[PDB]
């Protein structure tokens, strides 16, 4: 699996690029696609969302009806069109990839992002703190609140969990209610109901330092969290 | 003669002790118990998508998830809660008359006329199913197949031969022989330990999968036996045939314990299987539909009319929520 | 002179066996199927919230 | 009168007539899936046309020969109806026709040439004509456009009083009810020559019997039309008898199209 | 009600959906033709000739034939016959060379299916280099008393064609295509072509009432 971006550089305000994503390694077709994005020190932002077949496409409320996502399926590419650019849009911005069936984690995967520089309802949910020290070998547990249950019909609660560690890209560690990521060790666990979510990890490790963040995919648009660091 | 008299003799004496011996059949016993009434059941999902005859069909452990395969060569595997088709699996081969679900959920087995068993991974990095592996060596059709675990695997083909399989090494870890005439069908039990298969020699026979020898062997019967399956104890199995009758046999008593069968009733039985308390043995006939028969009273509990053609196929799910069915109609139904 | 030899061998083989006389067989299996029946949905069906189908 | 008595009763007898045996039609059709396919969808599609000109052209018929005060342009609304649920009758004849000529004439590659969408995209286009063809009136070409009297707004309902004579003959029968009639004489013809050539006296029997009834049941009231736009007269009598023989065509269809199918006939009596 | 990956879940079924009805369209313009005889009856001479289970798949005049050849089953227990309900036809292959009686017995089971009543069948003398220098040794009597006709290449041949005609036990609802032109001329598949065009459109016309 490899998802790598291009497109990224200096942009002055009211110009258009393209951001692209060429991936590589897994049934692409099969594979909605989402554009997030990471302002500098500030959190994950969701950006837009195509579905596989491109018969459903979404966009963050922020850039709704401003930029455009486009999938290429025969060339496993998807592109992400940005028609004017304010200096909000100054950030590194991530290709992902999402299947959805009965099962499935529809964020295992994410790309090594591309950075974008610009001169000068909605669910809310907020990370408790932002920095907790601790040392290897000390269990910790993040947590974060949401505005509704995220608990839907289905018995789903549509909860992530990411862990960003320093200069590279988020990696999934929960994609419902600790049901843990393929190839992510067994200590991290999740847990939570419907609005106080908590993410667990017993015998902390030294690769185990960066931000926690906690998505929401109960609707549209996609919210992040603030982002929790862990420091040692 | 000598090996031809011990033979008559061994089998006459043994027989006849077993006849003595025997007490009273499964109705004897279970007179004062009350019935079930008529099983009602009605079709609470319709799976379509199937385009040809649909032969072969298996619930996963989660009961939700099915397996089933058509003769067109697909596999879809299908979401009974909302009838969505997570998988679409195109066969290598579109003569496909059995299919099995792996207990842990990631693994798919089916083969047919290819002599063939095709094993599937559906977990896999990359969003696809694909073939994880092909285990060849039996020389007749391929008639059932079980996962025993996730890399171990039981057959029964028409060469009169069972075959325990290592999937990893590919190679047939034993062989299983004694029948004398196409084996259509096996049951494994619910330790994975045994397991009972009938061919059409008209004789069914209980074989362990560690010894590889020939433990028991059970007979009474007129023609071939195309079902069988055990009980939810793995201690006894209910087997259909082209006599348009089903027998329950038990593996300790080594006798026949009961009969299932109508007058009206003309036609041979395509699959059987059990409630989850085994109170409920569903048989598929050629007749277009599905009986429901009261394991311990012999009498047809219900009837899952609604087929417009041969039900080949049954399954009942590992929580007994529903009954999936399917027939030569291209149609499978749930039923609850 | 051994083909026939194997054949009565296995003749042999399923003639030594613990025999558990039938009605002792039949038994068992109602009390299992009796012990579950409350649990059992095509048996006794389960009200129409809790049915997935 | 004992005419007008006579003619309401014919009439919704052989309206209930029609709807029962294309209601049933529609049962044995729906029940079974096997009679799912191009032929069947033609034939339910005559079925639903002929449900149509049994249930509301039988009613409105009646009323229309009551003659009640019920303004122009109701009664203009009443004849379109009964001219497309009539023409869209008439369509599925054809498509009926046109899709055994097809089957007859393409051989191996007939399936590759009639998928599903094409067959829904013939059906919608004939409904969508006989809906056209029937409300053409409404869109200038009535009565209204050459009476004196342009502020008469209450009348008694007659199809006379309405529908100028001249449409139902040069535009409804000669492009509508004789083309199709030909067209299928044409197709037919050919058909029995092809399967002659092939090989056969029961396909022509029930070709001639589809022929017949057809031709039979929609001639009569289209020369009755003929003559009385001719400036001819015509006893009343005749034009009931006309009224009668169509809507029985209607009735008949289905007996001699889904009945001629073995598969048809087996669910049937199943049933 | 759905929950956003409920909806992204039926959109990839509807796609599955798509997928399979779209192959089933190309698996239903197919021709499928189950291949049977007896040992040594050029089954193996007609599959080469043709342009477990042994499927052989070619393209004859933009007809796409399936021809699937299950002589490799050594049980004659015909418990998978069923299996080859809706195929275009039956090639059955007899050679001139009891064995004759084997191939009558098996015609007979065949034709007598009930699983086969609607599927005509392509019986099949394809070689015609050897059926007459061997007529000369006998007359068809070493086993066959019946016969008292010339005992020539035509008559003989033309005998045995009818006596195997005579087995198709009903004549109202199946057809028998006979074959006599030798094997080395290129016929044999052109043959076939014009029998499959035969069956499909009398299924055809069987369907829409006109039969
Ligand atoms: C396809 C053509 N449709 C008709 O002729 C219908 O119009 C009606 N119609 C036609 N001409 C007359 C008429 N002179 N008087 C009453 N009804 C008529 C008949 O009921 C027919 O069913």
């Known amino acids: 699996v490899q998802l790598v971006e291009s497109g990224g550089g200096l942009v002055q305000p009211g110009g258009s690029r393209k951001l692209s994503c060429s991936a590589s390694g897994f049934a692409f077709s099969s594979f909605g696609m989402h554009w997030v994005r990471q302002a500098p020190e500030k959190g994950l932002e969701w950006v837009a969302y195509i579905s596989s077949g491109s018969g459903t496409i979404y966009y963050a409320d922020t850039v709704k009806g401003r930029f455009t996502i486009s999938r290429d399926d025969p060339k ?157 | 003669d000598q090996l031809r008299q011990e033979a008559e003799q061994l089998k006459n004496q043994i027989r006849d002790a077993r006849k003595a011996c025997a007490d009273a059949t499964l109705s004897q016993i279970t007179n004062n118990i009350d019935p079930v009434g008529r099983i009602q059941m009605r079709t609470r999902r319709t799976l379509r998508g199937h385009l040809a005859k649909i032969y072969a069909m298996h619930w996963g452990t989660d009961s939700r998830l099915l397996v089933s395969a058509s003769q067109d060569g697909k596999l879809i595997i299908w979401d009974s809660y909302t009838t969505n088709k997570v998988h679409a699996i195109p066969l290598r081969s579109s003569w496909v008359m059995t299919c099995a679900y792996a207990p842990s959920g990631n693994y798919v087995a089916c083969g047919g006329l290819d002599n063939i068993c095709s094993i599937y991974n559906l977990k896999t990095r990359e ?158 006939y050629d007749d277009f539909n599905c009986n429901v028969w009261d394991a311990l009273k012999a009498d047809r509990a219900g009837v899952l009319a609604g087929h417009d053609n041969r039900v080949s196929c049954l399954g009942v799910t590992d929580d007994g929520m529903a009954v999936a069915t399917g027939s030569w109609d291209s149609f499978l139904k749930i039923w609850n | 002179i051994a083909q026939a030899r194997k054949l009565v061998e296995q003749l042999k083989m399923e003639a030594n066996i613990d025999r558990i006389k039938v009605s002792k067989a039949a038994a068992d299996l109602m009390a299992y199927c009796e012990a579950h029946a409350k649990e059992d949905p095509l048996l006794t069906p389960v009200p129409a919230s809790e049915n997935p189908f | 009168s004992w005419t007008s008595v006579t003619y309401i009763t014919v009439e919704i007898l052989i309206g209930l007539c029609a709807i029962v045996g294309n209601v049933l039609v529609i049962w044995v059709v729906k029940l ?90 013939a059906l919608g286009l004939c409904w969508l004509v006989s809906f056209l063809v029937g409300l053409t009136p409404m869109f200038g070409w009535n009565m209204k456009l050459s009476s004196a009297d342009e502020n008469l707004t209450f009348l008694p309902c007659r199809f006379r009083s309405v529908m100028r004579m001249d449409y139902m003959v040069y535009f409804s029968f000669f492009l509508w009810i004789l083309v199709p009639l030909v067209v299928m004489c044409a197709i037919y013809f050919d058909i029995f020559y092809i399967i002659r050539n092939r090989l056969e006296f029961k396909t022509a029997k029930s070709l001639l019997l589809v022929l017949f009834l057809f031709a039979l049941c929609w001639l009569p009231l289209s020369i009755i039309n003929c003559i009385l736009y001719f400036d001819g007269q015509v006893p009343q009598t005749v034009l009931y008898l006309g009224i009668l023989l169509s809507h029985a065509n209607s009735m008949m269809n289905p007996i001699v199209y889904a009945y001629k199918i073995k598969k048809f006939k087996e669910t049937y009596l199943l049933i």
């Not at chain 4, 249930?55 to 497309?84: E, K, Q, R």
């Not at chain 4, 007939?110 to 599903?116: G, I, K, P």
């Open chain 4, 32 to 121: 079974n899936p096997s009679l799912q396919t191009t032929t069947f969808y033609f034939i339910v599609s005559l079925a639903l046309a002929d449900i149509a000109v049994g249930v509301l052209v039988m009613p409105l018929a009646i009323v229309i020969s009551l003659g009640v005060t019920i303004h122009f342009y109701s009664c203009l609304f009443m004849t379109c109806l009964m001219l497309i649920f009539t023409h869209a009758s008439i369509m599925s004849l054809l498509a009926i026709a046109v899709d055994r000529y097809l089957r007859v004439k393409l051989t191996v590659r007939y399936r590759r040439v009639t998928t599903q969408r094409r067959i829904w995209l």
């Open chain 2, 127 to 284: 969003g696809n199913v694909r073939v994880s592996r092909e285990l060849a060596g039996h020389t007749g059709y391929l008639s059932c197949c079980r996962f025993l675990d996730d890399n171990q695997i039981v057959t029964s083909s028409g060469d009169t031969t069972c075959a325990l399989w290592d999937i990893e090494t590919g190679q047939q870890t034993t062989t299983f022989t004694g029948h004398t005439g196409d084996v259509m069908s096996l049951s494994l039990a619910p330790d994975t330990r045994l397991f009972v298969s009938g061919a059409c020699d008209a004789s069914a026979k209980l074989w362990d999968v560690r010894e590889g020898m020939c433990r028991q062997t059970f007979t009474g019967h007129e023609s071939d036996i195309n079902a069988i399956c055990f009980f939810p104890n793995g201690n006894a199995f209910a087997t259909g045939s082209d006599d348009a009758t089903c027998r329950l046999f038990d593996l300790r008593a080594d006798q026949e314990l009961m009969t299932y069968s109508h007058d009206n009733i003309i036609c041979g039985i395509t699959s059987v299987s059990f409630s989850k308390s085994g109170r409920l043995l569903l048989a598929g």
């Open chain 1, 76 to 232: 496993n590419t998807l592109f992400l069109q940005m028609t004017s650019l304010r200096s909000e849009d100054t950030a590194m911005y991530y290709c992902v990839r999402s299947i959805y069936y009965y099962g499935s984690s529809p964020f295992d995967f994410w790309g090594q992002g591309t950075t974008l520089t610009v001169s000068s309802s909605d669910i809310v949910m907020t990370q408790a703190t932002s920095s907790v020290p601790v040392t290897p070998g000390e269990s910790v547990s993040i947590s974060c609140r949401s505005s509704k249950s995220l608990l839907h019909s289905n018995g789903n609660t549509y909860l992530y969990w990411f862990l960003q560690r320093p200069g590279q890209s988020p990696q999934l560690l929960i994609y419902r209610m600790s049901n843990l990521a393929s190839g992510v060790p067994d200590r991290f666990s999740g847990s939570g109901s419907g609005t106080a979510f908590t993410l667990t990890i017993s015998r902390l490790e030294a690769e185990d330092v960066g931000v926690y963040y906690c998505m929401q995919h109960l609707e549209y648009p996609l919210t992040f969290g603030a982002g929790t660091k862990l420091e040692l």
